[PDB]
Amino acid sequence: HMSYGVRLHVWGERALFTRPEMKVERVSYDIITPSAARGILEAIHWKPAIRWVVDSIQVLKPICFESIRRLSAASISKAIKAGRTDELVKYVEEDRQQRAATVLREVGYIIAAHFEMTDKAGPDDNVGKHLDIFNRRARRGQCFQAPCLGTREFPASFALLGDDDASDPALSGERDLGWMLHDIDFADGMTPRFFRARMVDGLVAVPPPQDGGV
Numbered sequence: 001h002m003s004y005g006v007r008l009h010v011w012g013e014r015a016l017f018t019r020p021e022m023k024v025e026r027v028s029y030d031i032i033t034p035s036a037a038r039g040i041l042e043a044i045h046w047k048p049a050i051r052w053v054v055d056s057i058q059v060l061k062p063i064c065f066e067s068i069r070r071l072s073a074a075s076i077s078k079a080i081k082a083g084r085t086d087e088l089v090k091y092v093e094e095d096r097q098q099r100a101a102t103v104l105r106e107v108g109y110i111i112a113a114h115f116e117m118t119d120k121a122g123p124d125d126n127v128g129k130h131l132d133i134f135n136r137r138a139r140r141g142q143c144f145q146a147p148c149l150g151t152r153e154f155p156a157s158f159a160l161l162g163d164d165d166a167s168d169p170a171l172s173g174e175r176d177l178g179w180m181l182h183d184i185d186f187a188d189g190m191t192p193r194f195f196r197a198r199m200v201d202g203l204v205a206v207p208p209p210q211d212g213g214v
Contacts, residue, residue: 001117003127005055007161008138010040011108014066015149016101020181020192026101028150030063031197034206035183037111040147040156045134048120054183057204058110062170066105069098070153107149110161135160166201175199182206182213 010032017029017036034054041052071091079087117127137143138160147156166172177197185191186209193213197204207213 001127003114003116003131005112005114006041006131006134006138007163008041008044008111008113008158009108009161010037010111010147010149010156010158011060012149012154012156013106014068014154015104015107016154017104017150017181026099026103026151028065028102028104029180030104030177031059031180031199031204032057032107032109032111032149033181033183035181036148036150037109037113038183040111040158041113041115041134043145043147043156044137044143044158045130046144047125047130049118049122049125050115050130051118051186052113052115053208054111054113054206056112056206058112059171059199059202059204060108060110060168061106062168064105065102067100068103069100071095103154104149166203168202171199171202173201177204183209 015028015032016026017031017033019027019029034057037054037057038052041054046052071094076088076091079085079091115127115130117125138158141158146152147158148154149156175198177199179194180197182193182195185193195207195211195213
């Protein structure tokens with residue numbers, strides 16, 4: 001059993017879909033990953049009975065980045081000159097505490113997903129019930145926890161869209177966004193998988209699990 005697809009407009013001032021291979025600095029992927037999209041639908045509603053599957057992502061806004069940080073050239077110079085490692089250690093600890101990042105700026109996507117009923121489904125569980133809890137909640141802007149744009153420091157706004165339906169020159173045509181995190185192993189909820197994302201007039205089809213992921 002699967003639901004009809006829902007459609008969820010998500011956006012924010014900033015986003016950070018952390019690239020996993022660069023495990024020192026935090027850099028964002030060019031667009032929301034399927035796992036982060038799944039993770040937003042689950043924030044609105046999830047239960048063991050159900051499995052959210054992301055089918056496609058529509059990028060609404062141009063891909064722009066920004067260097068951001070949450071003690072400078074001359075201070076280093078002076079503390080070395082003054083022979084003060086204590087201050088130099090404080091400056092190092094302090095720099096790490098800014099947790100420098102390269103984040104997406106002013107984003108907005110449309111997530112197209114559905115859920116499938118799981119083997120954890122009880123007699124009281126069905127598509128109708130669970131689809132209606134989701135829609136009621138999304139319409140109302142309420143959720144189990146605040147959805148995020150990749151990391152918890154970036155809250156996700158969202159509105160539910162209707163059933164039906166690319167004019168930005170930056171988004172049109174076929175574009176190869178290359179390899180990116182697809183989603184995490186359902187099984188151990190830890191070992192990541194990847195797919196080559198391709199974008200057509202904003203639309204990025206998302207392969208299912210059993211496929212040329214990794």
